Structures are given as structure tokens and as C-alpha cells.
Symmetry: C3
């Protein structure tokens, strides 16, 4: 019973699912246990869709920070007078302001589209609703919420017309993810602007973690990260994003984040995490794809890859976060203690400590 | 019965009242429905007073954003070394910072003074107290909480003297709102600064809503709005103000605010409102003068004026809010949706959708 | 039963205590009484250690605003690639960011080190844990929370040696505050930056409150105060500091803060305090060394020193706070009400109210 571990097979609630894909909402971080209370305004959403599909137009009373784990997506946000459309590849991230109507195409022919969105609801901490403009066997259009008179007046048309064309009270679709012809992807994709090296510090276009060099990278791992200091959209959310690769049989060395609260999601592969909290308490879990683990701020932890692994991290409370390592040569806080203090904090000579800590000649990732 | 509707006769508690005026406090938004949790920091206050009256000096442990619905006022904020007096007219808005001693005159001879303020308590979320300096048959001066010995040392006088002059333990007024002579309004007014075109973006002086052009206006209504982007006091509170007129028998077309939570207050007239939440849920209400209605962020709604109508609205969480209309020609999000997506999202041809969405030819306000 | 008085003897919990000093954590501000709910993210920590001692390296999931009440300290913050020592004197303040490893030396040979820190926990509002790197008879190292296998791989070493050097499962020390030699204090002191007049507005270094002229000073009292206006560290936190000396038999005149919530801490001496809330409510307490008292924003209060007195104040919600006195010549709000409104608000003529407010020729501090 590890409250910071959310196994994908029992921590989600399906919101919409059919033959074309699925939208699952993670359980609230706080309802499991009160140690995660300052995550109460955040939810994780998972979106997955079959090739040649579109998620129909809708908005939500929540900001979404979306990140493409794998596949390809056309994300099109439709404003009251304009339309922004973006071509997303793995590693691409983009903020969707609360209450923006958008739709989401998977234009690939064989690859499934895998998206995670950090949701930030506006009206009530941690709970929001999807408002679907469309009419569909799964859900009613929100335009159906207005009376016959009000609708007739607003559309300057008889109710029969507006019901036949918009609502369908057979003629309507089956779900909120539906299939596309080739011709329509051919037209829906061809206005979509793609992320670039020149977008890493843009205020509107999508940006990509992996388009820049890792902060740490050796023969055993790669750690990509983008922080509020570099991106104004992450600056506004006070969030950082990381995407880290670990070879099978290697680990990310024990470390902790000074002030950021980390939500990590397994994208591919499996891994063993150990987490330390306060006499000390060991928190352990064995993870697989779609699993979620949360590292409270300043709690040390380690990630031991048991297969080839990638995970995404969301860093809440991100501003001026420091990643402090407890082993290895680079970024090792323990080795920065004055020698006389090392002497008194541990049982052992200064030189006996100094020698023990110099042994691991590598940094960040090592072989296991 | 609609948790977002707050009928004026059932939703206000009277804080003070007598023959000269009255002050009432709206109920906590998050008590009425735990659906309005992110409004818990805010309260609505309604102030009304007769001609040639004054609300005596006091302060509160809340920020106020006050707005003059109708009538005329002199607002005087007293500082520890200074004093600022303002000449206020219908549409005039001003922030009173938390803990600022002030008093408030109705200088008019025949017109009642009607004011609404948005309260933002400091010590407890959504709860604050008024601290009256005056000693009055309806509340004790907060000077009276100090003991006799501390009073005498503080003021360097016998308690008899300070009691006689400050407290009167008859010689004191009957309530906190009391009548004024003509001579005194004469004296109290001749240093009051008035709002003006150049005050539209001050941090000091009152700014008037309806002194710029309306952002939408046609033959059926007018929509005045000032946002954080134009006025620095509104930027600090992160609030927008609107004032909107609607001719009897017209309506504000269905629309939603992308991210702003709106508290609206009926200033004059009668209206029916329809609000759509989530299968859809219809929330409907018939409103009149002094009633309040709350629209959560990204919930669509309509407002149908059954008599000539003016309402005031406060937008919580206002920065970069977008107003998205669902019908009419201008700022219509539905009509920004790509055509092939309209075909897949509604049960009807692409031309069938385009043809209906053009039928309504007006924007914003239409005749019912 | 004053819900704003936090008597030392029954409002603290001992976190650590041994022969060389002790750390204590004040009870939650809100668990006391629902009146202080907007202080639920804050906690007070009292620190005290004997001469020639050191607090062993640790970090916490909280920001600390620490303040030296009396004595001398070397504060060393160790970063992942750097180290920063500071030489602290009474009045010195420094923010220790969350998750910053640090150790705290008392280099004095006779005087104790009295420190208070304002904690702002990161993961759960108002609740944090200390993460000691050291393996001591009083607490396990958090490195012990990782498994045998993991620790071997990370430190490239057999578990016997890791255990034999860092953990020691007799060789280790008794508590988290331990004694120091004179060789060691020599060495830990010779790079220790010391606050001065060019750090008053640093974003990094200690700044001394008492190195500037006080804001109020006369023959009875001294009132030093530094605010977020002039120091970026306090600006990020939205906190002011004050330290005020009052001679025995003198008193701080009745006053309120407009918008700041004040946590005061008796450093040295005894005082009677009258607090006034809302008919009016009298709140009284006899304070002495280490007591804590909260003054909600906009509540008038008075400090009557019954022995030579110094206290420290944290002003939460500090930006643009105004201090309004209610007696004396300078910064007296009551003396700024127009004559005619003084005529209406008190049962005494304007001439009688004029004479009585003028009678206290002194300001801020006066003699009892």
C-alpha cells in the first residue's frame, strides 16, 4: 500500500471509450492519502486513439498542459475569430487555455496516438467537465441545454431545422472519437504549424524537450528537461517537464528535487522505484507502461530500469528547482559538505568518508 | 431549483440598517453549492443610503472593489498621514485596500445611493468584520476594547474626559448611517476628485465603465467591459467589470467565458437566464432587481431581458479571458470550426451546417 | 482562553532535544482556532543550542525564513556543486530555500544561539519533515531508506563498507546537535560571508534589520522594520520583518496593520498585550520569553512592556501594508478624519475632539 504509486489498472476512470480510442482520468492525488494535498488542483488525463481518427470539438473548464508521448497529432484550437493548428510529434508539448474549443486528429496510418494532459480545473479544485459541442450516441450537445424558444431565437430558424442539423433527436455518430477519410486528414493537417528549435521559448507554439541536448547523458541514460526559466508557457504554469531514457539494467542515481513535486508517468518499459520519506520509511513499487508515481518535493528516490525505459515527468512548483544527487561525481550534494562536518555527521574519518564517496566515478546514470 | 441563483430576498444577511440606509452581505458562494469552491475568497456587499446621509468612519479586514450602480457618492479614504476624496458617479469603480479607514456620503438631495462592492477578506477566506471608530447606539467603538488604564496613557488624559468626548457611556448617534446638513456636504465635497477619460488606467483614481465605447453594441443592447489589460487596479485583483444594457424583449446570445467566473447582479429590470452544465443539465432562473447569478467559467448561458435591463458583472480569474459566442455572425466559435469537422460532429451535411449557422444575421444581441 | 495567545509552555512540540540544544515546533495556527486559517501554510520553529555546537547537515520540504534573536551563527548552505557560508549576528535574516542542505554552527564560546525560523512547507500545507543526511543515535540517515542492492550499485561499493562508513548498523553520534572542537570551528569559519549595508536588497545574502535606522525611535522605544519593497527575498515571500525594543514601563501605542497578519515572538522580556476584535471583544494576555501572539490584519492592539522588551514580528501578506496609530501625533488616522465627520462620529464637539487627540504630544512609543 504505497500511496505514491498509482497502478494504471486500478487508478483510472474511463470517461469515453469505443473502438476508436479512450480518454481516462487519473484518480485524485489527494483522495488516496493526505500527503499529496498540494497536488489537489491537478489531474492527469490519458488520451489514446487509433490511426485516422478525430476527437470531436469540445472545451473544458480546465487548463490542459498536453504532451505527446508517442505517435503524431494535429491539435487544432478554435478561437472566437481565429484558428491555431499545430502538428505534434513525440516530445511536443503545448498548453490549452481553459475553455478553448479544440479537436485532436491522429493523422498516422498505423501508429496509435498516445497523449498525456496535465489538467488544471478552474471552478473547483481538481474536478472539471468536458463540454462537447457535438451530438453523439455517447453524449448530448451542450447546445441542447437551451430551451426551444431560446434556440429558435438565437439561430433565427425553426426548431425542426436546428434539431435535424445539429442534434438529431441514427443520423448521429457513435462516440466522441470517430473515423476520418484520407481526404479530410489531407485537408485538416495542411495548415498545421510544427514545433521548432525556434519555438523552445515561444509563448504560443508547441515546444519540444527532445529537440535540445539532454542536461545529463552518458552511455546508460539521457535526461531531457525544460523549465520555467526557458519557456514562458511553463513559466506561467510554474511547471517543468522532463523526458528521460534509461537503458535496461541501469538506474537513475539516488537524488531529490529541492522544491518541485514530480508526477512521473511510464511511457515505455518497466522500472523499479524506491522512495524515501520520514526512523526512515521505504516506499517501493514495480512499474509498467501507463503507471503513475509521484515524488513529493525533497523526497529522495531512485529509478532502476528493468527494461529499456522512457518516462515523462511533470514538475509542479518548478521555479528555481534544484536536482541534488547523493551518489556519483557530478551534482553530488553529499560531497559538498565540508570535510570536518562529514567527519561528525557520519561514523568514520574524513578520509574514510572522502574515499567512500569518490568510488562511484560516474554520474547520473550507472550500470546495474 | 438552481444553486447558481441567489434571490435577493433570501440570500442577503443584513449587517446594519435604519431609516437612513442599509448594508447587506451576500451568502458565501461555496456554502450555497460546493460547486463554487473557487469563489470562497469572495463576497458581495450591497450598500444603500438616503439623500444627504453618511456612513461613519470604519475599516474592514477585506479588500473592497466598489461600484456605484446609481445615484451619487463622495468616497473619502483616510490614511495615517493623508486623505483622498473622490467624486463618484454611476458606473464609477474604485478599490478600497484592506484596512483603509473611509466614509461614504450620498450628497444628492433626491436620489438614493446604490453601491455594490466585491469583498476579499484577509484573515479568513470569505469572512471579515467591520471596525467602526465612531461610538454609536448600534455598535461600540473599537477604542472601547482597550482598558481604562491603557486609554488614559495612550491619549494622556483621564478616562472621564475620553469617555465624554469619544464614547459617551444619546449624545451619540443612533446608527452607523446618519443624516448630514447641507453646509457639511458643502464642506465635505469641495476636495473630491472625479473620474475622467484619463482615469481609465490609473492605479489611484476611480475609473468609469461606460465612459469608453461599448465592446459590443447594436439596436438591442450595449456591452461595456473593462479588463485587467486596460486598468492596473483590475490587473492586481485579476478581475474584469462589465455593465450591459438589454432592451426589453431582447437577449444576449448564448456564449461562455473561457476562463472567467462571473458573478452578475441585476441593477434594473427583469430577466430570464438559462445556464447549461453537464447528458446536459439545464439551470434556469427568472431574476429581478438586486438578484445575483453566478456563471462558472466555460459554462454557456443566455440572458433574456423581459423588461429594460441593466446588470453589472464581476469576472473572477479574469486575465486573458475570451468570450465565445455560439450564435450570430461575430465571435462565433462554432463557425470557426473547419467544415469537414462540422460534418463529422453534427448529423447533417457540411453545407447543411453552414446554411443554418448563417441564418442568424445579427451579433451579440438579438430581438426575441 | 485567548485564541491568539500561544503560551510557550503548552503550544510547542519538541522535535529534537539533547544536552547541546533543542528544536521546537509551534502548534498549527489553525488547529488552535479557525480564526487563523489564512496562516495554515506557516509554522514557527524555535532553535537553541549551547556554545561550540553544530546542527548536522539536513534539509526540509519547506522554505525557512530564519532570524537570529541573540548569539552568533555560521550558516552554511551546501548546493549540488557549491557551498555558501554566512556569519550571522543578532538581527540577521536569511531565506533557506526548500530542499537546501544546510548546517548551523554556534561558534561563540559562552553565549547561546537563539534562532527562530518561519517555515513554509511545500507538499502539505503547514506540515513538513526534516531529512537528516547523518546517521545518529537520534535519527537514521535517509540514505538508509534505499535497499542493499541499490546502495551497492549507486556507491560502487559493498554494503559492509557503506554501512561501516555512513550508516553504522557507538561509532555514531548521540543527537543531531553535537559538540565541536576549536580546530573545527576555526576551519568552518574562514570563508563565512557576513551581512552588511550592501546586502539589504540582495536576493541571496543575509540582511540585517537593525543595520538601518529604525522607522520609529524615541526615548521610550525603537521600531526597526524591513519590507518586501526594499528586499527581494521578502518580496518573493510577501513578508516583512520587524524587531522592536520597548523600555520597561513604556508601551507601543494602539495601532493596527491594514493588511498584514503579524506573528510576534517575545525574544526577551515581559509584556501585556490588548487585542481588539469584533459590540467589541477584548483579547488580553501576559506574555513572556518565547511566547507567540498573532495579531490578525486590521485588528488594533497595544504592547505594554512590564520589563525591558524585545520582540520579533513576521508580517504575512505584507506588500503595501500601512501602520495606522490611534493615539499620538504622528501617523494618527483618527486625526485625519475631516472636522465635520469627527463632529458626527463622536459625542463631542469638533473642538473637544480636536483638543483630546492633540493631547498626546509623543508618537509611537510613550511612557506608562
Amino acid at each position: 500500500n504505497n500511496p505514491f504509486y498509482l497502478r494504471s489498472s486500478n487508478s483510472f476512470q474511463t470517461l469515453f471509450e469505443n473502438q476508436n480510442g479512450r480518454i481516462r482520468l487519473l484518480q485524485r492525488f489527494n483522495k488516496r492519502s493526505p500527503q499529496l494535498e498540494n497536488l489537489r488542483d491537478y489531474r492527469i488525463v490519458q488520451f489514446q486513439s487509433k490511426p485516422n481518427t478525430i476527437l470531436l470539438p469540445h472545451h473544458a473548464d480546465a487548463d490542459f498542459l498536453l504532451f505527446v508521448l508517442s505517435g503524431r497529432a494535429i491539435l487544432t484550437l478554435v478561437n472566437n475569430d481565429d484558428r491555431d493548428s499545430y502538428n505534434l510529434h513525440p516530445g511536443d508539448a503545448q498548453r490549452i487555455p481553459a475553455g478553448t474549443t479544440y479537436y485532436l486528429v491522429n493523422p498516422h496510418d498505423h501508429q496509435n496516438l498516445k497523449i498525456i494532459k496535465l489538467a488544471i480545473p478552474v471552478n473547483k479544485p481538481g474536478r472539471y467537465d468536458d463540454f462537447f459541442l457535438s451530438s453523439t450516441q455517447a453524449q448530448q450537445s451542450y447546445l441542447q441545454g437551451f430551451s426551444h424558444n431560446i434556440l429558435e431565437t438565437s439561430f433565427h430558424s425553426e426548431f425542426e431545422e436546428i434539431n435535424r442539423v445539429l442534434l438529431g433527436e441514427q443520423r448521429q455518430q457513435e462516440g466522441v472519437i470517430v473515423e476520418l477519410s484520407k481526404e479530410q486528414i489531407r485537408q485538416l493537417s495542411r495548415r498545421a504549424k510544427s514545433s521548432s528549435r525556434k519555438t523552445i521559448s515561444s509563448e504560443d507554439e508547441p515546444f519540444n524537450l527532445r529537440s535540445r541536448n539532454p542536461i545529463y547523458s552518458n552511455n546508460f541514460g539521457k535526461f531531457f528537461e525544460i523549465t520555467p526559466e526557458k519557456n514562458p508557457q511553463l513559466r506561467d504554469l510554474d511547471i517543468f517537464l522532463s523526458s528521460v531514457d534509461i537503458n535496461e539494467g541501469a538506474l537513475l542515481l539516488p537524488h531529490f528535487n529541492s522544491k518541485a513535486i514530480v508526477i512521473l508517468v511510464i511511457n515505455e518499459g518497466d522500472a523499479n522505484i524506491e522512495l524515501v520519506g520520514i526512523e526512515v520509511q521505504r516506499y517501493r513499487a514495480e512499474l509498467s507502461e501507463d503507471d503513475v508515481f509521484v515524488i513529493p518535493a525533497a523526497y529522495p528516490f531512485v529509478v532502476n530500469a528493468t527494461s529499456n525505459l522512457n518516462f515523462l515527468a511533470f514538475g509542479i512548483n518548478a521555479e528555481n528547482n534544484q536536482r541534488n544527487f547523493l551518489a556519483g561525481e557530478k551534482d553530488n550534494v553529499v560531497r559538498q559538505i565540508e570535510r570536518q562536518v562529514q567527519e561528525l555527521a557520519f561514523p568514520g574519518s574524513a578520509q574514510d568518508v572522502e574515499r567512500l564517496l569518490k568510488k562511484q566515478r560516474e554520474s547520473y546514470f550507472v550500470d546495474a
